[PDB]
Amino acid sequence: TSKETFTHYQPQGNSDPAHTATAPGGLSAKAPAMTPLMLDTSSRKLVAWDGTTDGAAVGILAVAADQTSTTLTFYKSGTFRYEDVLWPEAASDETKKRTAFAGTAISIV
């Protein structure tokens, strides 16, 4: 009757340690966890990834925050599944999303 599924939550993709860091925040709206972030072009705060600025991704948000959060905590390294990352809708290319974090310590599997 009441199908109540329970699935294990494994954002980690490899044995790579997932190191976190804190940086000044510049969000404009509520942002859940596991959201890619980039640096602001002008003011260099942290903003949610637009999905269209190629190669500007720098990390994945560690804990859900909002625009009132002065400092954001986000991962600097590790491996993440393609399904657990809350990708922006504007990024509709699978190939680009696989290599969105190319050049940094983030990896997508």
């Binding site: 009757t1 009441s2 199908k3 109540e4 599924t5 329970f6 699935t7 294990h8 494994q10 980690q12 993709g13 490899n14 044995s15 599997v109």
Partner: protein, 49 residues
């Protein structure tokens, strides 16, 4: 599967599983019968005469 990965480039990990549950609660039945207190004075089809 675990197709080929060599002991130098060890990679992807696996997922644990689960996620099914259902509840089927009540059930019930009770077939009450009578004793026939005044039917015992005669003789049954059993009990040879």
């Amino acid at each position: 599967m675990a197709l080929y990965v060599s002991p130098i480039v060890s990679g992807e990990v696996i997922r644990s599983r689960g996620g099914s549950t259902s509840e089927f609660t009540p059930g019930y039945v009770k077939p009450k019968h009578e004793v026939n207190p005044q039917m015992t004075l005669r003789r049954l089809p059993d009990e040879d005469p």
